[PDB]
């Protein structure tokens, strides 16, 4: 119950949430993993560098671990180690984890995840704050919502389209319900960075934004590639490779969400192969295999995939004009992220007053480099709030 | 045994082939279809027009038919109704169906399938020839090979890359082995049209080529879009939509063949959803549901998918120069095919001496309009041989 008390200005009632997956669901997951088949070996699946996707060796090993080493209960207990709640917004059940401070002057911050992530991606950071502060000394209110369509949050709606602006509207309303209408800051990566930009652009309660992803093309009337250094050019090269050789998954999410939704819902191995590839290719240092199995099992048990990809038709079909962030804007650069563009480019998309360049780390910053992201966010808030 | 005798000039021995899937394999297929799960309904899967891919209604209905109405034996008997053989080429087992004439002057023709097709796509055409001729009067030798990686043909190799040129080399060698080194003609659609073009371009034994697909962009120094009619422009519009909204599947096949190969090998429902979408969207008039189930079951039982997509990295990463077809070139235009470009454009890619424009029909011409494709091919051969 420590860090679980709602701010005095919150207008909603606390509805504590606990993850409790029935044994039957875990048994059926195991059964389906066991019955699932693996593709026959091919030239492509035998390439150790995995330039064609996951290897047969990796998938075979993971399937075996999922059946003999994997245990959901310990992970579930970990999920339940932090305060969690649910509240209804526009008919949707919105789940969120949080660490609330008892300090009246604490700065409200919403940490937004992306795909194939979830609220759990921020647990390592919440853990650091919990180890370093007490409810009476915590400088911030940390809210980690599950975006519509992800894990324990329901939706999106079945009778109407839902996009990035709708996601932004839900996040802003949640913060207002928790009593942060006078102001809050947003931290976002992946899809959360798209939502975060929209919040910084059109929602007044959002006072500042810190992102670790700025997907963009060469600026209009700004710095050209020829004005960039060797290191910055290597980054642009990596971005071009991602946009040409690494975006197929996104194009399928965007153009045929119904088909891929059904494909990945049919077998847990299908889901593991598709999402696992990203947990393997988007990081700097390899993640523990059990971490990947936990994340995939979480998506499977909550039927997240088919509901979460609705935003791809908008992120994967301006930044200097209509979507320019006029409010204090901060950025944390990790070299192995998907689109490592230079500071000069990011600076054209908003009032960039804070920039931190890191030597290591990939796409899942909160998971890979929690100390660095936490440290960066703290410095940003202290500077602009 | 009618139409099964090899030409007198064949250098290889006939190895009759028969399809015989063990009951156990059929039982496991049924079991996996039953245990497979379907995605929860979403806004996207409830769209009747299916602009986002297959609908929940369709997949649910097909799964039910697969379990209660589908019977493999009758289809298998149909597969075995025509002469089939296997032969080894470069270490690969190459399967092929055929109707051999007893006439010494019969024109050798190889009919090449594509993805998600197979040799069976040409059975309706072989059926028409068998009903209209006897071995003594058949004017052509009709060879329908299974390209490397498809159904009963093995490969591609596990220790080296394999591409379109390799496929062309195998087809040319097969025809030579059957004794057609003095000359043969090729008919091709989909991937078969890419292989067919390469055969017309660099293999001397190939005397002429007839295609029903000519994937291309606006010609270099040739006819512009402004020089096209209203009908032709509508065709170009359909091609642009396919290239922008309908190519995601190909981009995944091209960039991450290992991942998607494993994804679709995990469950028969995953395979049905992915391939079924194409059998639904690429045709003019809807195909019988049982036909789709038969084709998908064939791919499943032969583990075709992961092995067949190797060519996408080359078809989905010139036509006026290096790949220009100097030999007699013919084309059959079906309005609902994937890339319906105008005759003026196709004419820039080869010595086009034959063109047939049809009012109806889609991508699977051999399946959809067998009478038309057969007659077009016959007219072409008579004109250029």
XYZ file of C-alpha atoms in Angstrom:
770
model
C 0.000 0.000 0.000
C 3.070 2.251 0.078
C 2.928 4.793 -2.784
C -0.678 3.767 -3.482
C -2.585 6.774 -2.134
C -4.212 8.960 -4.804
C -3.309 12.681 -4.840
C -5.703 14.849 -2.832
C -6.985 16.491 -6.032
C -7.917 13.225 -7.767
C -11.601 13.106 -8.730
C -11.813 9.344 -9.264
C -12.045 6.502 -6.762
C -9.131 4.077 -6.366
C -9.914 0.622 -7.783
C -6.895 -1.546 -6.859
C -6.005 -4.067 -9.554
C -4.182 -7.388 -9.229
C -3.054 -9.751 -11.994
C -4.502 -13.230 -11.469
C -4.378 -15.588 -14.458
C -6.332 -18.842 -13.852
C -4.348 -22.096 -13.957
C -6.517 -23.230 -16.872
C -5.235 -20.389 -19.064
C -1.642 -21.268 -18.232
C -2.332 -24.929 -18.995
C -3.855 -24.100 -22.379
C -0.887 -21.866 -23.181
C 1.501 -24.725 -22.422
C -0.637 -27.147 -24.433
C -0.625 -24.875 -27.484
C 3.119 -24.287 -27.201
C 3.633 -28.049 -27.162
C 1.372 -28.784 -30.123
C 2.667 -25.900 -32.255
C 4.929 -26.889 -35.102
C 8.196 -25.327 -36.233
C 9.080 -24.694 -39.869
C 11.395 -27.169 -41.594
C 14.968 -25.828 -41.742
C 15.714 -23.518 -44.653
C 18.725 -21.615 -45.922
C 17.210 -18.475 -44.389
C 16.550 -19.938 -40.935
C 20.097 -21.349 -40.746
C 21.774 -17.932 -41.036
C 23.452 -17.285 -37.682
C 23.459 -13.502 -38.161
C 19.673 -13.664 -38.440
C 19.492 -11.191 -41.320
C 16.343 -12.999 -42.494
C 14.656 -13.059 -39.107
C 14.748 -15.509 -36.197
C 16.776 -18.690 -36.596
C 15.511 -22.233 -36.256
C 18.030 -22.797 -33.464
C 16.703 -19.849 -31.451
C 13.027 -20.703 -31.871
C 13.640 -24.364 -31.004
C 15.557 -23.430 -27.847
C 12.941 -20.870 -26.753
C 10.069 -23.296 -27.290
C 11.883 -25.833 -25.091
C 12.464 -23.239 -22.341
C 8.840 -22.091 -22.538
C 7.794 -25.676 -21.781
C 10.352 -26.685 -19.136
C 11.877 -23.567 -17.549
C 9.190 -20.888 -17.817
C 7.041 -20.127 -14.767
C 4.363 -17.431 -14.913
C 3.693 -17.130 -11.178
C 6.999 -15.440 -10.204
C 6.585 -12.908 -13.033
C 2.968 -12.314 -12.050
C 4.060 -11.704 -8.468
C 6.517 -9.176 -9.856
C 3.717 -7.510 -11.830
C 1.779 -7.232 -8.577
C 4.730 -5.803 -6.639
C 3.753 -2.230 -7.577
C 0.456 -0.352 -7.115
C -1.965 -0.967 -9.995
C -5.470 0.327 -10.643
C -8.136 0.499 -13.316
C -10.545 3.307 -14.124
C -13.082 3.839 -16.887
C -12.537 6.495 -19.522
C -14.929 6.845 -22.451
C -16.258 3.366 -21.749
C -12.781 1.823 -21.872
C -11.193 0.137 -18.875
C -7.821 1.814 -18.442
C -5.190 0.020 -16.406
C -2.201 1.798 -14.910
C 0.655 1.160 -12.515
C 1.884 4.002 -10.335
C 4.070 5.358 -7.562
C 2.294 8.303 -5.941
C 4.200 10.720 -3.722
C 2.760 12.158 -0.510
C 4.416 15.496 -1.294
C 2.018 18.240 -2.374
C 4.644 19.688 -4.731
C 5.510 16.407 -6.478
C 5.695 16.726 -10.282
C 3.161 14.501 -12.127
C 4.745 12.400 -14.860
C 3.164 9.879 -17.232
C 5.559 7.282 -18.722
C 4.209 5.955 -22.053
C 5.159 2.568 -23.503
C 4.982 1.350 -27.080
C 4.762 -1.864 -29.104
C 5.702 -4.668 -28.411
C 6.120 -3.214 -24.938
C 3.694 -2.572 -22.109
C 3.530 -0.908 -18.701
C 6.023 -3.491 -17.401
C 8.790 -1.948 -19.506
C 8.940 0.789 -16.859
C 9.104 -1.476 -13.804
C 12.911 -1.332 -13.585
C 12.629 2.474 -13.321
C 9.814 2.384 -10.753
C 11.987 -0.069 -8.818
C 14.854 2.436 -8.742
C 12.583 5.200 -7.415
C 11.108 2.893 -4.764
C 14.604 1.925 -3.601
C 15.742 5.558 -3.492
C 12.745 7.330 -1.934
C 9.908 6.943 0.553
C 6.368 8.161 -0.172
C 7.180 11.307 1.839
C 10.317 12.154 -0.155
C 9.429 11.006 -3.690
C 9.793 14.123 -5.926
C 7.420 12.896 -8.631
C 4.080 11.158 -9.148
C 4.866 8.357 -11.619
C 1.941 7.076 -13.674
C 2.483 4.220 -16.143
C -0.723 3.598 -18.087
C -1.525 0.681 -20.348
C -2.551 2.315 -23.620
C -5.936 1.306 -25.077
C -5.593 -2.131 -26.638
C -2.669 -3.222 -24.447
C -2.588 -5.892 -21.750
C -5.049 -5.063 -18.976
C -6.574 -2.026 -20.679
C -9.599 -2.856 -22.836
C -10.504 -1.504 -26.262
C -10.106 0.025 -28.737
C -13.825 0.392 -29.603
C -15.468 -2.126 -31.925
C -17.825 0.331 -33.633
C -15.524 3.192 -34.629
C -11.923 3.883 -35.647
C -9.393 4.787 -32.934
C -6.100 6.581 -33.530
C -3.148 8.381 -31.982
C -5.199 11.454 -31.076
C -7.728 9.236 -29.290
C -4.892 7.625 -27.326
C -3.616 11.086 -26.408
C -7.094 12.135 -25.295
C -7.359 9.112 -22.988
C -3.935 9.737 -21.419
C -4.706 13.420 -20.812
C -8.061 12.522 -19.224
C -6.449 9.961 -16.931
C -3.951 12.530 -15.688
C -6.776 15.003 -15.122
C -8.785 12.368 -13.240
C -5.801 11.757 -10.961
C -5.810 15.495 -10.254
C -3.022 16.699 -12.543
C -5.045 19.209 -14.529
C -2.755 22.016 -13.364
C 0.118 20.321 -15.159
C 2.052 17.147 -15.924
C 5.036 16.012 -17.964
C 5.254 13.115 -20.412
C 8.042 10.659 -21.168
C 7.587 8.556 -24.268
C 9.262 6.131 -26.623
C 8.004 4.179 -29.655
C 4.240 4.672 -30.053
C 4.361 6.546 -26.769
C 6.548 9.151 -28.474
C 3.894 9.742 -31.142
C 1.243 10.093 -28.455
C 3.618 12.203 -26.383
C 4.189 14.607 -29.259
C 0.427 15.036 -29.744
C 0.030 15.761 -26.037
C 2.777 18.370 -26.154
C 1.208 19.869 -29.263
C -2.490 20.111 -28.409
C -3.177 19.510 -24.722
C -2.623 22.441 -22.376
C -2.239 20.391 -19.179
C 0.861 18.821 -20.724
C 3.647 21.236 -19.757
C 6.721 19.484 -21.172
C 7.711 16.382 -23.123
C 10.735 14.091 -23.027
C 11.136 11.538 -25.820
C 13.671 8.877 -26.744
C 12.391 8.377 -30.311
C 11.973 10.993 -33.034
C 11.040 9.217 -36.264
C 11.549 11.708 -39.091
C 12.993 12.356 -42.546
C 15.576 14.949 -43.578
C 14.315 18.425 -42.490
C 12.600 20.705 -45.075
C 14.594 23.947 -45.116
C 17.060 22.792 -42.485
C 20.347 20.861 -42.023
C 21.170 18.461 -44.853
C 22.948 15.110 -44.534
C 26.133 16.708 -45.883
C 26.284 18.913 -42.777
C 26.445 15.854 -40.522
C 29.466 14.160 -38.947
C 30.695 10.627 -39.631
C 28.997 9.257 -36.514
C 25.738 11.027 -37.302
C 25.821 9.673 -40.863
C 26.234 6.125 -39.567
C 23.096 6.746 -37.521
C 21.193 7.929 -40.574
C 22.403 4.830 -42.409
C 20.942 2.620 -39.682
C 17.664 4.519 -39.927
C 17.534 4.051 -43.689
C 18.144 0.312 -43.289
C 15.298 0.092 -40.778
C 12.966 2.014 -43.092
C 13.831 -0.229 -46.049
C 14.708 -3.661 -44.643
C 13.166 -3.505 -41.178
C 9.690 -2.020 -41.624
C 7.760 -4.929 -43.160
C 6.154 -5.884 -39.854
C 4.812 -2.339 -39.508
C 3.482 -2.287 -43.068
C 1.515 -5.452 -42.342
C 0.215 -3.973 -39.053
C -0.801 -0.858 -40.977
C -2.397 -2.337 -44.084
C -3.775 -5.676 -42.902
C -4.261 -5.491 -39.124
C -7.134 -7.957 -39.215
C -5.150 -10.640 -41.006
C -1.983 -10.416 -38.926
C -4.116 -10.118 -35.787
C -5.665 -13.500 -36.545
C -2.357 -14.999 -37.617
C -0.611 -14.142 -34.332
C -3.627 -15.084 -32.217
C -3.689 -18.643 -33.597
C -0.570 -19.956 -31.848
C 1.732 -18.758 -29.066
C 4.712 -19.789 -31.208
C 3.515 -17.492 -34.002
C 3.380 -14.637 -31.510
C 6.820 -15.535 -30.123
C 8.411 -15.572 -33.565
C 6.946 -12.205 -34.607
C 7.526 -10.290 -31.364
C 10.640 -12.217 -30.375
C 12.400 -11.076 -33.527
C 12.037 -7.486 -32.328
C 13.213 -8.164 -28.783
C 16.283 -9.692 -30.452
C 17.039 -7.094 -33.144
C 16.068 -3.801 -31.505
C 18.227 -4.045 -28.372
C 21.928 -3.293 -27.893
C 22.895 -5.947 -25.330
C 20.812 -9.176 -25.561
C 17.894 -9.452 -23.127
C 17.515 -12.522 -20.889
C 15.514 -15.205 -22.706
C 13.074 -15.477 -19.799
C 12.297 -11.771 -20.127
C 11.233 -12.319 -23.732
C 9.087 -15.303 -22.763
C 7.413 -13.268 -19.998
C 6.579 -10.367 -22.326
C 5.209 -12.656 -25.032
C 3.174 -14.667 -22.508
C 1.762 -11.406 -21.149
C 0.622 -10.410 -24.661
C -0.815 -13.885 -25.258
C -2.755 -14.102 -22.001
C -4.277 -10.639 -22.532
C -4.942 -11.025 -26.280
C -3.038 -7.769 -26.721
C -1.631 -8.053 -30.199
C -4.769 -7.771 -32.342
C -6.029 -4.832 -30.263
C -2.767 -2.914 -29.881
C -1.776 -2.453 -33.520
C -4.591 -0.033 -34.393
C -2.154 2.921 -34.314
C 0.089 1.573 -37.068
C -2.215 2.817 -39.798
C -1.318 6.316 -38.541
C 2.348 5.927 -37.531
C 3.120 3.911 -40.670
C 1.025 5.451 -43.495
C 4.690 18.399 -40.524
C 7.076 17.966 -37.588
C 8.482 21.448 -38.235
C 5.039 23.043 -38.399
C 1.700 21.575 -37.301
C 3.310 19.020 -34.985
C 6.116 21.249 -33.712
C 6.435 21.037 -29.914
C 6.426 24.616 -28.605
C 6.612 23.514 -24.968
C 9.911 22.535 -23.262
C 11.152 19.504 -25.200
C 13.805 17.024 -24.087
C 15.464 14.065 -25.815
C 17.569 11.057 -24.784
C 19.588 9.588 -27.634
C 20.417 5.879 -27.578
C 22.563 4.716 -30.556
C 20.881 1.373 -31.184
C 17.320 2.692 -31.344
C 15.419 2.293 -34.622
C 15.798 5.791 -36.080
C 18.982 7.404 -34.665
C 18.732 10.890 -36.164
C 21.061 13.784 -35.193
C 20.322 16.509 -32.649
C 20.215 19.165 -35.381
C 17.276 17.353 -36.992
C 15.391 16.724 -33.751
C 15.879 20.399 -32.875
C 13.744 21.402 -35.881
C 10.747 19.517 -34.469
C 10.420 21.436 -31.217
C 11.707 23.727 -28.492
C 14.579 21.354 -27.701
C 16.122 22.632 -24.468
C 17.546 19.331 -23.254
C 19.569 16.655 -25.063
C 21.505 13.682 -23.688
C 23.689 11.511 -25.915
C 24.475 7.982 -24.711
C 27.214 5.628 -25.887
C 25.152 2.447 -25.557
C 21.570 1.218 -25.436
C 18.860 0.384 -27.937
C 15.121 0.744 -28.508
C 13.859 -0.489 -25.124
C 15.616 2.223 -23.106
C 13.482 1.771 -19.983
C 14.340 -1.954 -19.983
C 17.923 -1.756 -21.239
C 19.243 1.390 -19.537
C 16.817 2.210 -16.690
C 19.406 4.148 -14.666
C 20.202 6.385 -17.628
C 16.607 7.065 -18.627
C 15.621 7.782 -15.014
C 18.610 10.072 -14.533
C 17.874 11.913 -17.807
C 14.171 12.351 -17.022
C 14.943 13.640 -13.529
C 17.406 16.199 -14.912
C 14.892 17.287 -17.550
C 12.087 17.828 -15.040
C 14.353 19.742 -12.626
C 15.362 21.997 -15.510
C 11.956 22.786 -17.044
C 9.343 22.472 -14.299
C -1.060 -44.411 -68.157
C -2.538 -42.429 -71.044
C -0.351 -39.390 -71.847
C 2.344 -40.752 -69.522
C 4.957 -41.937 -72.025
C 8.154 -39.853 -72.125
C 9.209 -38.376 -75.491
C 11.611 -40.582 -77.439
C 14.403 -38.013 -76.963
C 14.130 -37.893 -73.157
C 17.404 -38.805 -71.445
C 15.929 -39.517 -68.014
C 14.020 -42.515 -66.695
C 10.331 -42.156 -65.776
C 9.755 -42.297 -62.004
C 5.947 -42.269 -61.580
C 4.813 -40.281 -58.550
C 1.627 -40.624 -56.505
C 0.389 -38.435 -53.654
C -0.235 -40.490 -50.518
C -0.584 -38.571 -47.256
C -0.704 -40.877 -44.186
C -3.866 -40.775 -42.059
C -1.756 -39.639 -39.111
C -0.796 -36.416 -40.908
C -4.431 -35.690 -41.698
C -5.382 -36.379 -38.080
C -2.728 -34.007 -36.751
C -3.864 -31.336 -39.210
C -7.434 -31.651 -37.956
C -6.245 -31.600 -34.338
C -4.249 -28.403 -34.877
C -7.146 -26.758 -36.701
C -9.385 -27.579 -33.731
C -6.941 -26.351 -31.060
C -5.998 -23.174 -32.903
C -7.504 -19.984 -31.522
C -9.120 -17.095 -33.371
C -8.460 -13.452 -32.528
C -11.070 -11.627 -30.441
C -13.337 -9.481 -32.634
C -11.958 -6.043 -33.453
C -13.156 -3.038 -35.431
C -10.861 -4.156 -38.255
C -12.053 -7.778 -38.384
C -15.706 -6.674 -38.423
C -15.384 -4.706 -41.688
C -17.453 -6.583 -44.284
C -15.517 -5.117 -47.224
C -12.383 -6.682 -45.757
C -10.195 -3.660 -46.464
C -8.114 -4.634 -43.423
C -7.751 -8.283 -44.356
C -9.862 -11.370 -43.659
C -12.929 -10.965 -41.464
C -13.696 -12.824 -38.262
C -16.872 -14.160 -39.867
C -14.970 -15.646 -42.810
C -12.218 -17.240 -40.733
C -14.730 -18.705 -38.270
C -16.807 -20.204 -41.098
C -13.754 -21.634 -42.876
C -12.395 -23.195 -39.696
C -15.764 -24.898 -39.165
C -15.817 -26.223 -42.746
C -12.220 -27.428 -42.454
C -13.292 -29.535 -39.467
C -16.673 -30.855 -40.620
C -16.908 -30.631 -44.421
C -13.324 -30.912 -45.678
C -12.092 -34.270 -46.988
C -8.545 -34.645 -48.312
C -8.962 -38.015 -50.028
C -11.171 -36.829 -52.932
C -8.777 -33.943 -53.633
C -5.800 -36.289 -53.417
C -7.476 -38.634 -55.891
C -7.876 -35.625 -58.157
C -4.183 -34.795 -57.761
C -3.428 -38.362 -58.832
C -5.756 -38.237 -61.840
C -2.962 -36.908 -64.099
C 0.521 -38.314 -64.820
C 3.088 -37.189 -62.234
C 6.795 -37.894 -61.897
C 9.883 -36.828 -59.990
C 13.457 -36.493 -61.188
C 16.631 -35.205 -59.571
C 18.236 -32.002 -60.772
C 21.256 -30.554 -58.969
C 20.456 -32.721 -55.964
C 16.888 -31.430 -55.750
C 13.879 -33.684 -56.186
C 11.776 -32.020 -58.872
C 8.134 -32.998 -59.151
C 6.053 -32.397 -62.256
C 2.688 -33.270 -63.719
C 2.387 -33.738 -67.472
C 0.404 -34.684 -70.543
C 2.788 -36.070 -73.154
C 1.720 -36.385 -76.778
C 2.628 -39.354 -78.955
C 3.090 -36.996 -81.911
C 6.707 -36.439 -82.944
C 5.936 -32.837 -83.934
C 4.173 -31.868 -80.698
C 5.303 -28.492 -79.305
C 6.882 -28.741 -75.809
C 5.373 -26.280 -73.333
C 6.195 -25.714 -69.663
C 3.421 -24.075 -67.599
C 4.881 -22.260 -64.562
C 2.901 -21.531 -61.394
C 3.538 -18.925 -58.714
C 2.790 -18.223 -55.047
C 0.464 -19.145 -53.325
C -0.219 -21.476 -56.232
C 1.244 -24.803 -57.272
C 1.164 -27.289 -60.132
C -2.517 -27.953 -59.362
C -3.444 -24.465 -60.592
C -3.041 -25.875 -64.114
C -5.159 -28.998 -63.665
C -8.302 -27.373 -65.103
C -6.320 -26.665 -68.294
C -4.802 -30.147 -68.486
C -8.345 -31.460 -68.013
C -9.538 -29.488 -71.038
C -6.745 -30.888 -73.215
C -7.401 -34.444 -72.011
C -11.108 -34.092 -72.843
C -10.352 -32.644 -76.278
C -7.510 -34.864 -77.502
C -6.091 -38.378 -77.400
C -2.366 -39.075 -76.943
C -2.129 -39.517 -80.725
C -3.712 -36.153 -81.548
C -2.480 -33.903 -78.713
C -0.629 -30.993 -80.417
C 1.559 -30.159 -77.412
C 3.635 -31.748 -74.662
C 2.376 -30.062 -71.470
C 4.795 -30.053 -68.544
C 3.723 -28.511 -65.224
C 6.660 -28.542 -62.811
C 6.595 -27.811 -59.102
C 9.197 -25.081 -58.664
C 11.945 -25.701 -56.078
C 10.488 -25.156 -52.618
C 6.893 -25.957 -53.630
C 4.743 -28.924 -52.653
C 6.343 -32.165 -53.798
C 9.571 -30.611 -55.075
C 12.312 -30.427 -52.436
C 14.734 -27.593 -51.710
C 15.873 -24.900 -52.021
C 19.383 -25.801 -50.755
C 20.228 -25.286 -47.086
C 23.859 -24.263 -47.608
C 23.615 -21.574 -50.287
C 21.278 -18.853 -51.552
C 18.807 -19.712 -54.335
C 17.119 -17.187 -56.624
C 15.070 -16.628 -59.755
C 17.970 -17.502 -62.062
C 18.468 -20.788 -60.209
C 14.765 -21.570 -60.665
C 15.095 -20.798 -64.373
C 18.146 -23.056 -64.637
C 16.232 -25.952 -63.070
C 13.238 -25.522 -65.389
C 15.458 -25.376 -68.486
C 17.342 -28.505 -67.371
C 14.099 -30.390 -66.777
C 12.876 -29.588 -70.278
C 16.224 -30.693 -71.700
C 16.058 -33.931 -69.701
C 12.622 -34.632 -71.170
C 14.198 -34.197 -74.601
C 13.149 -30.653 -75.479
C 16.613 -29.227 -76.034
C 15.730 -28.367 -79.625
C 13.078 -25.990 -78.329
C 10.200 -25.319 -75.945
C 7.790 -22.526 -75.041
C 6.958 -21.178 -71.590
C 3.716 -19.916 -70.092
C 4.001 -18.099 -66.796
C 2.138 -16.020 -64.262
C 3.156 -14.584 -60.866
C 6.629 -15.849 -59.886
C 6.435 -18.043 -62.970
C 6.395 -14.871 -65.075
C 9.663 -13.697 -63.508
C 11.213 -17.099 -64.163
C 9.637 -17.138 -67.613
C 11.187 -13.797 -68.503
C 14.640 -15.018 -67.439
C 14.214 -18.125 -69.587
C 13.242 -16.027 -72.589
C 16.186 -13.727 -71.934
C 19.088 -16.103 -71.312
C 18.265 -19.693 -72.267
C 18.502 -20.577 -75.948
C 16.268 -23.664 -75.811
C 13.406 -21.376 -74.787
C 11.981 -20.218 -78.136
C 9.027 -18.086 -77.018
C 7.307 -16.841 -73.871
C 3.690 -16.158 -72.977
C 2.969 -14.309 -69.734
C -0.122 -13.096 -67.898
C 1.752 -10.834 -65.467
C 4.155 -8.009 -66.290
C 5.036 -6.214 -63.064
C 6.650 -2.911 -64.034
C 6.797 0.847 -63.481
C 6.208 3.633 -66.006
C 8.591 3.094 -68.989
C 11.871 5.098 -69.180
C 11.789 6.952 -72.503
C 8.412 5.565 -73.510
C 4.631 6.161 -73.162
C 3.646 8.268 -70.153
C 0.478 7.896 -68.073
C -0.989 10.949 -69.815
C -0.985 9.022 -73.109
C -3.259 6.356 -71.619
C -7.034 5.946 -71.868
C -9.545 6.097 -69.011
C -9.724 2.307 -68.734
C -5.942 1.960 -68.804
C -5.612 4.624 -66.100
C -8.025 2.735 -63.863
C -5.756 -0.273 -64.300
C -2.708 1.750 -63.299
C -4.643 2.983 -60.264
C -5.295 -0.602 -59.200
C -1.601 -1.379 -59.622
C -0.594 1.604 -57.495
C -3.006 0.513 -54.757
C -1.501 -2.976 -54.791
C 2.039 -1.569 -54.601
C 1.128 0.710 -51.685
C -1.652 -1.014 -49.735
C -1.345 -4.607 -50.920
C 2.368 -5.423 -50.854
C 3.036 -5.826 -47.124
C 2.936 -9.626 -47.294
C 5.637 -9.577 -49.987
C 7.813 -7.164 -48.012
C 7.711 -9.560 -45.066
C 8.499 -12.517 -47.373
C 11.390 -10.516 -48.792
C 12.944 -9.062 -45.649
C 12.150 -11.608 -42.932
C 11.478 -14.949 -44.645
C 12.710 -16.900 -41.628
C 10.336 -15.217 -39.212
C 7.209 -15.430 -41.344
C 8.152 -18.972 -42.337
C 8.061 -20.013 -38.670
C 4.935 -17.978 -37.988
C 2.919 -19.709 -40.721
C 4.328 -23.145 -39.929
C 3.095 -22.994 -36.325
C -0.637 -23.370 -37.006
C -2.792 -24.297 -40.013
C -5.101 -21.395 -39.126
C -2.183 -18.964 -39.410
C -1.452 -20.342 -42.868
C -5.140 -20.159 -43.838
C -5.443 -16.536 -42.769
C -2.309 -15.411 -44.640
C -2.842 -17.340 -47.879
C -6.633 -17.263 -47.735
C -6.606 -13.476 -47.812
C -4.932 -13.668 -51.219
C -7.289 -16.290 -52.639
C -10.061 -13.885 -51.597
C -8.630 -10.564 -52.792
C -6.754 -11.479 -55.967
C -9.589 -13.195 -57.860
C -12.429 -11.678 -59.895
C -15.267 -14.107 -59.136
C -15.015 -15.773 -55.681
C -13.460 -19.251 -55.614
C -15.292 -22.153 -53.933
C -14.368 -22.294 -50.236
C -13.357 -25.945 -50.532
C -10.846 -25.007 -53.228
C -9.144 -22.614 -50.809
C -9.092 -25.243 -48.064
C -7.566 -27.780 -50.471
C -4.794 -25.419 -51.568
C -3.951 -24.407 -48.008
C -3.986 -28.022 -46.814
C -1.656 -28.926 -49.686
C 0.806 -26.233 -48.569
C 0.506 -27.359 -44.958
C 1.036 -31.059 -45.613
C 4.095 -30.356 -47.790
C 5.582 -27.612 -45.574
C 5.695 -25.466 -48.708
C 5.429 -21.959 -47.352
C 8.801 -21.532 -45.630
C 10.637 -23.054 -48.608
C 8.748 -21.333 -51.419
C 9.229 -17.687 -50.475
C 12.969 -17.578 -51.206
C 12.334 -15.718 -54.480
C 10.680 -12.720 -52.847
C 13.984 -11.136 -51.913
C 14.532 -10.822 -55.681
C 11.012 -10.086 -56.969
C 10.357 -7.631 -54.131
C 13.664 -5.801 -53.478
C 15.948 -3.038 -66.764
C 12.895 -4.517 -68.487
C 13.592 -2.362 -71.552
C 17.246 -3.381 -71.700
C 18.979 -6.257 -69.902
C 15.739 -8.173 -69.328
C 14.098 -7.320 -72.657
C 12.611 -10.430 -74.285
C 13.936 -10.545 -77.858
C 12.181 -13.825 -78.649
C 8.476 -14.005 -79.642
C 6.583 -12.634 -76.642
C 2.870 -13.012 -75.933
C 0.603 -11.612 -73.222
C -2.884 -12.339 -71.849
C -4.414 -9.413 -69.992
C -6.890 -10.100 -67.192
C -8.340 -6.923 -65.573
C -8.360 -8.102 -61.967
C -4.741 -9.256 -61.847
C -2.373 -7.485 -59.440
C -0.589 -5.112 -61.824
C -2.873 -4.387 -64.822
C -0.561 -2.265 -66.971
C -1.382 -1.200 -70.567
C -0.213 -2.941 -73.732
C 1.955 0.043 -74.686
C 3.993 -0.460 -71.502
C 4.289 -4.234 -71.835
C 5.392 -3.738 -75.447
C 8.522 -1.912 -74.248
C 9.667 -5.009 -72.348
C 9.919 -7.379 -75.302
C 9.129 -8.437 -78.852
C 5.383 -8.433 -78.158
C 3.755 -10.081 -81.180
C 0.631 -11.358 -79.427
C -1.774 -9.637 -77.026
C -5.192 -10.762 -75.776
C -7.387 -8.435 -73.694
C -10.086 -10.051 -71.537
C -13.130 -8.440 -69.923
C -13.052 -10.553 -66.759
C -10.714 -12.657 -64.651
C -8.127 -12.038 -61.965
C -4.699 -13.192 -60.801
C -5.249 -16.974 -60.891
C -6.011 -17.115 -64.617
C -5.391 -20.854 -64.959
C -7.877 -21.482 -62.130
C -10.366 -18.705 -62.877
C -10.457 -18.650 -66.689
C -8.916 -21.950 -67.885
C -10.714 -21.920 -71.255
C -9.411 -18.436 -72.017
C -5.826 -19.080 -70.978
C -5.749 -22.378 -72.886
C -7.098 -20.815 -76.065
C -4.796 -17.811 -75.794
C -1.768 -20.084 -75.330
C -2.808 -22.314 -78.230
C -3.213 -19.302 -80.524
C 0.167 -17.949 -79.427
C 1.999 -21.210 -80.102
C 0.391 -21.697 -83.498
C 1.407 -18.155 -84.442
C 5.058 -18.215 -83.311
C 6.244 -21.831 -83.452
